[PDB]
């Protein structure tokens, strides 16, 4: 009902934070030449359509992606608002939206749903990723409170604490995107509740530069490409 | 349940002599609020009837014409302490259901002072308004313990800016 | 003026057609019928606030008899704090 | 010890059909100083006792004017007596602009009833905490209306409102033929009210500042008296 | 009392809207049984008339309403809630005939009225009406027809629907007639035999004979829904009494 | 474990009934006794008016209200609620007369009056009207008499009684309709109305009263609703007195 | 102003929606299966009386000529969503693109309507779970489930209502990635034969398919460009003929 | 001590069985908890004064000025300062200037007092009624051509009295008793200054000086002015020799 | 209005224990923010919590926020709220010039901010902001430094030095001993040195945690980098060693 606890703390935000603390794990890592996003997906359903095109990971425009921990129903309302804002910026300025302007845009909407008592807050945590000329490769996180922070590597959702410790000891400022592929897969295999990692339990993506000077490219990996980085990395659930 | 009959007696004559404090008016109202706590804890009637007599001696008379009863109410520390002391006795009895017959009688003396538009009458208006407020959940049963003219003497106590 | 003949008519069409309907129901059925219909619409409009959705409401289309009809206004449609401090008064 | 479940909201009914909040709104009239209203065949009169909170304090206003032909007294809530009196003056002006009459005081009664009954029927407010005596004169003669805030009214030859008013009421009732005949000598209709209001003063006294008198009948329009204007009436 | 769950239209832990279940007990506040049947070219509605006080005018007691030229309904529930729902149904038929240029089907009015009941069944500040509405017509698309609508906003077609606090006996006798006859309508070519058949079933089910003033009748043919007067009912009661 | 169903208006109790509309009729059961008698060509209204002080101004405090011109209205219970429902009725009939250029049917004024009262049983933001109305008149179909509840229920009647004395009044109205099955005349209904009202005042013998009566007869008053006064009132008072002093 | 409904319970749960999934769990079962060349959606019709004519209570509904829907839960909630879902398909997509929306865009729009009912004062969430099934030129055949939360899921097969856990276990046991539309119809008729509360025949059972185009059902010839409805609702005689092959 | 609670306490927009509104009544009791403010009206000027609480040296004075200009002929003393006190005062400022530019003359002090009380009846910014309190006690002082030098106690209720002299804040009883025992229609401006300082001395507990006390007056000739610390000091010196002269 | 003052025991009115008191509790839990005036500058300083090892410093927001070319705002309490509170103030100032041919006055940037905070207190089951702020800068065509504090209730006040958030008692105690209102720090360097000494007593570890912005007349706004505040910290720590070794025993 958006009233303070006597400590000056918001009960609804704390309960929304309890909800996302169950909501599946996501890791993001910022290499010297690209960003990696990975998310672990609890497929307890055989008849759920794996090889559906998205669940945890989404495009916001041609150079920005997100991972979702939380309610996917809540996330998709924010994701569409961010997509509309990215194209409305591109229409106005003829230029691609800077990552800080969009990440904090979704952090200002999520704060409003925490102040007015007719609205429940959004049960979603986002690990944003992208490139722009103002900064370069940027990795941000945002949570049900409307707080947002810049990171070199971060986890959200379940098992955050184990994942942050594993990131901290292996992360290097000068590492390449293929080292961040390896690291994010290792971290998730060293954090997972499921017995071993496999291509349908895993959502993956990258924000590389490629060979051509003007390019930045956002491969949100199809299952067969994820099977290749799995067998190359030594996670290798292979015949 | 700790003090004796010589220590509670010292406490009483200290709070009662603070009812006639010649320099402070805030120490005269504070003392009533505490003489109520002394009186509420009495278990027998003979102390209370003698206190009622002490406080009623300056009151309970037609010795004053309305202009004396008015000008004394702006000035006189003695009747101020006696009205505050009798209101302290009345407010010590918030929830006694069959209303003791001395309460209507002593409310009748206070309600003469409640019309007097100064510091002495103020203590009486506060006494009667606090009384009606605590007796607002019993009032259909307590209205029987008063005469018709006594219930009218309880009426006009709120001199608030928004009551016409 | 230089302003299209049809502009002021089509701007106010939705309001005008309901205002005209309520006056017919007052005339044919008495003051109780538009008093009932305006209070149903008040409960539906006033208890249905969500800063990110502006695309009408499902029960308002049932109440307005618009549940199987499209206008050009439904195919061609046209800050959360500014919405909040309009809904509550500033 | 005797909690009432049915007095929280103005919209609740008691199991016996009472509107307790509205009956509590009447008990606010008993919080004011006494005012007395009375009429002959040709004049209506209001006399009102005014309180203060301290001897340094200006006395409270009790009689209000709505138009040359009517006005009112207020023994209840003063800031809420400004809401009704504003609305009555607004209606007097509406009648002179929109109908070119002036608002006959029976019609004024019907409009106050409508406004107070609306407060009494809808959630998210309170009953009015004020009783009004309205006095007026029009084509149907000298008129006196007791508005009670439940949304009701009655035509009366006289009445008293405020604390200790059963005294003044009983004097008007024992001295009615005395004031109903008076007519062309309006000062005895004023002294009739001053005897009546004097019965509610329990050895309090009238003073030049404590008392206000208002009269409205025939040509002489609605007028109010204060200070030495009420010294010849002590 | 479980707080708001029982006093507004919101789900109990079980998933029960107590505002809707209680509104189905309101429909039996009249103590009236009504019966409806389809013939070959007509549909008929027969309703128990209660006038206990000598002081009433029986010409003003009626639970049968003319909704338009071709369509009519009986209501089970309080008369204030039956007159409110009749006035809506009259307005909804009038606006449909204007918008679509043809006469409002009984199926469409039952759906339109049932969609309105779904509002009060979801909005917490709206209560479901305390009435069951039993629409009848001779639709050019579905011939004689019966459609029933309820406080939960659930509506369905019928061939012999009935609402009342003794409705189970009437319904169980109707089901046994339709089981033996196997046609889904009563095969009379004129409405007089249909009404007489509908007064033979309500006598046999309710265990009492009826006077001409203790019975109601409705006659929905093509081009007209209309109500019978007590002498037209007595012609049928006389023909029942001439047969047995 | 609790009964919060009676605190609010848009709520059914477990049995499926609005308890606020059941408490609003208790406000009517405290009201002034009043009746309407329907004749062979009209409607009579009669009321026992309690005079709680001599100050009550005479012949200006009135319980019979003339809705439109061809209809009459007497109500019992919360007086402010009857005034509100009497002013809305006047608006209703004035609208029909400006639009259709004919007086409103009494059956149609009753329906519009019964839909306004039911609308206050829908929403918790308002309470029911704590008043019952008797109203009736002469139109192009002759004489109609209606009685309307806090619930919005209304029916037509041969005679109707409301308020405190309703028991004794209903029993006498039943005697009338039984002795006069075809119906009673206009002059027989005013005399018999006074008898019924005096007999209902036997519940409250110490609370002195006035009788107020009105016509609406096609022959006696050309079909307009009109007040009963003077000799016909005194001829009714003497009938009431000689039959209640039944020695 | 202390105004919302479906607020968070201290364990991180939405509460009212949980009670809305108990209303869904009480409905007559519905189910859906996706095949290699078509899709099937199916349910039982429960009569309030045997005097009721359940040719009037359709439970399986056309959303666009290539998209079908069915429910479990409160049927009144489902009549109101289906007509908004139809209006949405025309106003948002057909009237801008001259072609009907896919079965992922219409499912998103239905789910957006159910999400708005959770995040509101004044309104309870829906008492229905919807199965939406269809075809599109680039996605191909698809089946989705939508719940009172506004969460939507793509499924190979699913069931909802009373018999749903036994139905979902049979659907896991029988589903394979090479089913055809006549096979999926047989599996769906077998699954309802276990979940049926009443009698089992072509009159009590609702069954629809999105399959090949049917140029007969377009009702006008001369335009091959227009292929004709993929959505077809099985006739009561076809259901009885297939129920003779059972 | 013994408990004395009723069931009518804490009622919002509700009457007790006597008619008592307990939210506005409990708001009127806060005239004993504030810092002391005193007003003295005379035929020569309205003397307003407030006791200062000693500040941190870092808090600069203009942050806490409890005597304020509304207009050149009107000023407020407050016993306590809140955002609502500045809201009342800035409404009074905006009301006084909007009056002067619409009516071409200076606002009557009664009419300004009524306009700040109308803000309180609205509860800021539906029928405006006296149900809940707003803000704090103001002593409004001013001078106009029609009703002269006027001191108003404007209360949280939206009602007020004119007073000849009024004290608010923690000296209220002992101050008002000494004011009513001592005030004349013969008070000169000088004697009104020594009288307010004699009253202030007696309540303040501390030794009275130009750092714990503040003075002002409204005069018609000079307008409103807050007094210089040197001027209150030479007045306080004059009080010392007036009592030493006994 | 709190503690041991209780007549005939007690009972509560509408009053003190309220949403705004719990917003004041949220403000006290947010990092320490300080501001001090000088002869012709104003310096605002903040506590960073010590950044985590995987946090990205080059994009991390400067805690002290520029509202306009001559106005600076810092806060303690809820960050999300301060972001929503700075946006309103920034557009309010840009809109000021566009409609008044006048840059926003520091006192109008403080009355507006506290003013909007007061509206979220007043009513509606919309909560007040869990935020308290320092607003500092210069008016145009003036050389007087200004420094205001605002609180969740919408009360505001002017200070020649102030501190808000965690441990602010100990900082205000140090400022009352080291800030003389007759002779304030006469030079920017001394003003910055005073804020670094003031913060060094309360910050978690050292030069990591301090960050400062210096405002000067004529829109000369200037954030100091880590390397510049490291040379201040080092100079102050040199003087501590010098003072200790200048013990005479």
Numbering used by the authors:
A (entry chain C): 10 to 248
B (entry chain O): 1980 to 2143
C (entry chain P): 48 to 125, 137 to 148
D (entry chain F): 1 to 234
E (entry chain A): 9 to 252
F (entry chain G): 4 to 250
G (entry chain B): 5 to 250
H (entry chain E): 1 to 125, 130 to 250
What does the paper say about this structure?
Blm10:13S, which includes α1-α7, β2/β3/β4, and Ump1, was the most abundant complex and resolved to 2.84 Å resolution. Here, we report the cryo-EM structure of the Blm10:13S assembly intermediate to find mutually exclusive binding of Blm10 and Pba1/Pba2 to the 13S based on overlapping interaction surfaces at the α-ring and common binding of their HbYX motifs to the α5/α6 pocket. The Blm10 dome in Blm10:CP contains a large opening of 14 × 23.2 Å that is situated laterally above α2 and α3. In Blm10:13S this opening is substantially smaller, at 6.3 × 11 Å. This constriction is caused by Blm10 loops spanning Asp155-Asp166 and Gly221-Val238, which are ordered in the Blm10:13S structure, but missing in the Blm10:CP structure 29. Since the smaller opening in Blm10:13S would cause steric hindrance to the entry for an unfolded polypeptide, we refer to this configuration as in a closed state. In Blm10:13S there is a loss in electron density for α2 Met1 to Phe7, α3 Met1 to Phe13, and α4 Met1 to Phe18 resulting in an open gate. An open gate, however, might not enable activity for this complex because the Blm10 dome is closed. In the Blm10:13S structure, Blm10 is 34 Å away from Ump1 and does not have any direct interactions with the features of CP that are indicative of the immature form (Ump1 or propeptides).
